[PDB]
Amino acid sequence: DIVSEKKPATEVDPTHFEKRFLKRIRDLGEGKVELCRYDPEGDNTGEQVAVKSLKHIADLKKEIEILRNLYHENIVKYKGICTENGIKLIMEFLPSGSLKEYLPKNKNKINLKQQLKYAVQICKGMDYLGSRQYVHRDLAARNVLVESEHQVKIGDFGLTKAIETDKEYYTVKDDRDSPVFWYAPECLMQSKFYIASDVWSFGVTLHELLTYCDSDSSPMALFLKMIGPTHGQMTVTRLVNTLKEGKRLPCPPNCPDEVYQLMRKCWEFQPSNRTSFQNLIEGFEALLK
Numbered sequence: 001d002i003v004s005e006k007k008p009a010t011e012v013d014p015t016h017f018e019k020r021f022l023k024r025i026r027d028l029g030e031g032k033v034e035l036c037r038y039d040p041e042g043d044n045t046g047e048q049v050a051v052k053s054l055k056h057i058a059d060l061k062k063e064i065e066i067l068r069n070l071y072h073e074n075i076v077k078y079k080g081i082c083t084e085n086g087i088k089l090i091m092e093f094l095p096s097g098s099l100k101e102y103l104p105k106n107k108n109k110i111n112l113k114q115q116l117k118y119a120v121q122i123c124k125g126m127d128y129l130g131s132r133q134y135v136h137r138d139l140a141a142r143n144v145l146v147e148s149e150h151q152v153k154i155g156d157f158g159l160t161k162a163i164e165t166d167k168e169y170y171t172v173k174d175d176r177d178s179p180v181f182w183y184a185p186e187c188l189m190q191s192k193f194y195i196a197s198d199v200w201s202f203g204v205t206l207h208e209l210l211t212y213c214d215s216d217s218s219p220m221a222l223f224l225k226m227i228g229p230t231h232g233q234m235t236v237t238r239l240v241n242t243l244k245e246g247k248r249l250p251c252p253p254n255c256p257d258e259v260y261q262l263m264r265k266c267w268e269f270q271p272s273n274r275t276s277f278q279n280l281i282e283g284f285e286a287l288l289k
């Protein structure tokens with residue numbers, strides 16, 4: 001008789017998504033994120049998932065490993081991977097999108113009390129990330145996903161880096177696509193990323209939330225009005241100059257001064273003088289009481 005291999009008992013990994021059942025619906029945003037239906041039964045009843053893939057393979061693999069081990073109410077859920085060298089990150093899908101799409105469409109529903117509750121949830125997610133010794137480096141309203149009218153989640157970890165044990169910051173090398181208008185002075189000047197640098201980005205995200213992500217009131221729009229919109233390659237040094245002078249984004253319309261003061265504590269020039277996420281949580285909780 002012909003010799004063959006004994007078949008070992010097959011086990012199913014719920015985090016392993018087969019390419020043949022992962023069916024594309026549409027692009028969500030750009031590296032790119034797509035809405036897919038994982039449909040192993042082929043009858044359009046499968047679960048909708050968000051799929052992150054490459055248009056850098058090493059960076060995607062590191063991102064997958066970070067997200068796989070993060071478990072928090074305000075952090076988007078990892079679901080698994082789809083493997084070819086190629087890899088796709090599979091996450092839960094949030095149909096409301098980010099604060100960038102949701103806030104302009106739901107102003108009537110989202111009052112100051114709800115905005116402060118979203119602010120608390122962003123801080124809780126960020127404080128959990130910091131407790132795991134990570135710096136996010138991309139905290140912006142476009143990366144805050146809306147689970148429901150009552151809950152937001154940090155939804156992308158593409159620039160997330162680990163801070164070495166007993167060290168205070170991570171030094172960046174690849175910075176060409178940096179979101180400079182959300183960056184603290186130490187990031188712009190020395191490419192040094194502290195947990196306090198994410199606190200700075202939070203202050204900017206809080207400004208966006210309070211303006212309902214209005215494009216005319218965006219941090220880029222406002223800073224470009226303050227420094228000049230036609231400076232090209234000179235834009236960042238003009239931005240650094242402005243921040244050194246003590247100039248900050250103005251108080252959002254209808255934002256009470258006590259909320260604006262918490263926001264300004266995120267924007268102290270020196271990282272050591274900035275508020276912590278825990279102190280922000282306490283400040284917002286005192287305003288909600």
Ligand SMILES: Cc1cnc(Nc2cc(N3CCN(C)CC3)cc(S(C)(=O)=O)c2)nc1Nc1cccc(CO)c1
Pocket residue numbers: 028029030033050076091092093094095096097098100101142143145155156
């Ligand atoms: C992990 C995840 C789960 N669920 C969603 N949902 C979702 C997202 C969006 N985008 C949010 C970011 N915007 C700049 C572009 C639109 C839109 C919809 S919708 C309203 O069209 O159904 C849904 N997106 C995810 N990630 C994702 C998608 C796109 C871009 C980024 C990076 O900012 C992260």
